């Protein structure tokens, strides 16, 4: 057995692998995180529940003091009809007569939004409700992401920030050393492998697996190690980003999902807290100055608030060709980062420390096993980039040079046969990407409905079909969301309940 | 709309075809079926199937002389006299781990017993439902792809019954039913089938033409020159040769089908409500078929020349293209692999499934087709990798065809599935990436069955608290002791519902 992990950054990617390996593990593992002290609001995913889960956390603990609120899924405004919307939900699509609602939505539906006519959380999120009633009762221990089996209806909204403080807390209590000090010099031994990382004021920290948590820098994984980054600038050229935090002046108007709407030269976050928005306008510099991007995003949410301060950022787009080098292994931005069009920052962590766990080294190392996770977090990675990139390609607005360029842009290999496919019949669990990459079926479909890649026809087959089955369901749906708004609290009351 | 579909063939392959079509499309749909004048088992998603078509079990299964299937037991293909059962049973999962992985770290009890309820079930000859009916453990008009939750079981039956009782179902929702010999089978100009050319009933017309005419391929093949792609270079099996074989004792009714590995291949053994059926899978390169008939002979029915031996020749492989120009195959005209898996049914039973799913309008989209047809391809090639995985996984090397299946060809992707298991267990990303039937636990069960173990179990396992997997193996065991003193043997219960 190995004995000891040094974690290189703190953070989200820091905290969230310390207090894992010591939920996993105890007292049967030796960890230390080593974080420089010369160092806003993001979403999630359902499943980062399993997380949460695994390390024994109720929401009912954290959420509060990390400014949280509920996210049902995300509200996609502007990018195709001026105006118009519709959501990506955490909800997946009903199956009648072994079609899914949107393959009847083609031949029987009302062609307003799909999301309206297939999705209970569509009237939810316009009603503002929360997700559970006001005694705690939901509306509809130690697993994995692997073990998501139905659809959990909601993620989070946070102050990252004070996450990683929550999770620091926690890993720390349960034999985490911290220090707080700057990496001076990676060492290494004669294989190439990493034998310790030389301190300012703690000397040399040395351990048997190194954890790279140094974000977009990837100290180690990059700048010691050599790996290679994959740049994705070629199919997704957004760049840089400039963000905002937004008093709420109204506490009603607190939404229970993200926002991407699109924007002049890229498009713009509105993440929820409680008592505040952050916003952000991600965007390609090749289109909009720095100082033209913030102009436009104050003009839009904060007209007059000079007051508030604008946090400029670039970013580092594409993936390390492997994650997992030597003794060495990549977790959160210094291992990828795509722009967070669909809010999968926490699950790219997750996911690799979930992984790190299930392919954590014996004292004997093994190359089939480490191939094995690198072929995992580049398959992760490359399912969300051709994801990303039909969000692009189905935008139908083209009023700017932003919005003209992304049509005619470079795209990944795959993209090709599944655009072929979705102007003839709906995308299914077969024909998009294979590999696992925080996707299904439902979410590669809304988007393309939603954005409007559209078949040309129906499936012919729900011609021959009986409807009324489909149509008792639109029904349904219809009927269910009109009770569930009656009977829910809003967004704001339900968390000012619990804070 | 296309109006009419003419089904060339019966068996089961024309009959669940015709069934399925009226259940799916009732008066929307014209159906003809033109035919000519043992035992088999299936997958428990085949409930999925007659649920569609409004079937109970309990009018039919003892009509086909049915039995029930709660896996498959695997004897005799590594150490001699070993065996385990490959069953319809997930992997429970303690700390994100499964139950495979926990039993490489703390467990040594073979794999299956350790790990499966089934494998205890099966040895003490249990059947899957109490006699009141209920299930140890209708869904209407749903599909294989709204499987959720591991149903428990599946069936042993008569396929001619089967096909018979199903020809009645079609026939009394519409199905006109042509007895008769196909003499021509006309096409256009454009090569698309025109119709079809009978002794006695003139040319049977229509939009699309199914071709359920079985090895010989009579549309797709020989009328259309489809390719049949051989898989004799990886699975050499080429022949076989079946007795059915009178249950003296009623008790000695199996719930599960026996894979027997033989000198030259492997024999099937079905249990149906009153016979087993057995039936003897060999290649003619290395045993002749009176040579093979013998051994049969030997090991299930000495002395037993009242008896018929049917012979059999088996075309290996897929068509390249199951769907060409207005005809698809559905059954063994399409594709077939030796039943060591029990997916006959199951071939036919998605064929026509994504055929529903794929139905055709009068544009005839070839982007629709052409998505049929890589469905159909991948179902098979799937099958495929995890077929020849078998025959590496077997530990025997004592005749002549054993040694030669250690060093035969095998299909390129399964290279990096044998360098991986002798690492870690395989996974759902590394396990065949499209749908075929089978998920991770059968990959595995196979693997740590035959005998392709890790070198060492995973290390994550050693720096955990092993209480929980403890905890889980044996509340196994513990329901398993209850079960098999709460249920009814598997004769007992099917006798009860005839
Ligand atoms: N599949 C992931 C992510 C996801 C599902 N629906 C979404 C809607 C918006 C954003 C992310 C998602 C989950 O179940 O949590
Ligand atoms: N996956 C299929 C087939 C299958 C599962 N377990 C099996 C055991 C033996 C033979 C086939 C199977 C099913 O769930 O029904």
Request: with cysteine; aromatic share 12%; proline share 5%.
């Amino acid at each position: 057995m190995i004995r000891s992990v040094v974690i290189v950054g703190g953070g989200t990617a820091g905290w969230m692998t310390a207090s894992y390996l010591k939920a996993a593990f105890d007292d049967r593992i030796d960890v230390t995180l080593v974080e420089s002290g010369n160092v806003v609001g993001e979403a999630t995913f359902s499943t980062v529940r399993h997380f949460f889960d695994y390390l024994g956390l109720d929401e009912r603990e954290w959420l509060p003091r990390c400014a949280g609120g509920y996210k049902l899924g995300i509200r996609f405004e502007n990018w195709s009809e001026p105006g118009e919307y519709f959501y990506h939900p955490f909800e997946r699509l009903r199956v009648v007569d072994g079609f899914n609602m949107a393959e009847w939505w083609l031949a029987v539906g009302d062609r307003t939004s799909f999301s309206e006519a297939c999705y209970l959380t569509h009237r939810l999120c316009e009603a503002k409700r929360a997700p559970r009633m006001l005694d705690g009762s939901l509306f509809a221990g130690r697993s994995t992401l692997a073990e998501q089996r139905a659809q959990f209806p909601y993620a989070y909204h946070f102050d990252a920030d004070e996450v990683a403080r929550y999770l620091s807390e926690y890993a720390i209590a349960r034999g985490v050393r911290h220090v707080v000090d700057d990496v001076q010099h990676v060492g290494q031994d004669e294989r190439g492998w990493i034998s310790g990382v030389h301190t300012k004021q703690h000397g040399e920290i040395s351990g048997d697996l190194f954890v790279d948590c140094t974000g977009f820098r990837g100290l180690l994984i990059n700048q010691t190690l050599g790996g290679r980054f994959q740049s994705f600038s070629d199919v997704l050229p957004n760049n840089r980003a400039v963000a905002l935090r937004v008093p709420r002046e109204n506490d009603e108007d607190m939404r229970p999902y993200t926002t991407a709407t699109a924007m002049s030269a890229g498009w713009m976050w509105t993440i929820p807290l409680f008592k505040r928005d952050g916003n952000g306008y991600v965007y390609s510099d090749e289109f909009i100055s720095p100082e033209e991007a913030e102009r436009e995003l104050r003009s839009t949410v904060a007209p007059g608030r000079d007051d508030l301060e604008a946090n400029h950022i670039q970013m580092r787009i594409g993936r390390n060709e492997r994650t997992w080098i030597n003794n060495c292994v990549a977790v959160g931005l210094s291992a990828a980062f795509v722009e967070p069009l669909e809010s999968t920052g926490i699950f790219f962590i997750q996911h690799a420390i979930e992984q790190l766990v299930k392919h954590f080294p014996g004292e004997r190392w093994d190359p089939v096993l480490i191939s094995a996770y690198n072929e995992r977090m580049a398959h992760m990675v490359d399912g969300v980039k051709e994801f990303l990139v039909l969000h692009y390609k189905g935008a139908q607005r083209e009023d700017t040079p932003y919005w003209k360029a992304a049509k005619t842009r470079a795209m990944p290999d795959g993209l090709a046969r599944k655009l072929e496919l979705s102007a003839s019949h709906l995308l299914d669990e077969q024909t998009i990407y294979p590999y696992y990459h925080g996707f299904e079926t439902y979410s590669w479909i809304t988007m393309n409905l939603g954005l409007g890649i559209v078949p040309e026809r129906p499936r012919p087959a729900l011609l021959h079909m009986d409807p009324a089955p489909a149509l008792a369901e639109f029904e349904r749906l219809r009927r269910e969301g009109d009770e569930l708004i009656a009977a829910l609290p809003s967004c704001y009351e339900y968390l000012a309940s619990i804070q």
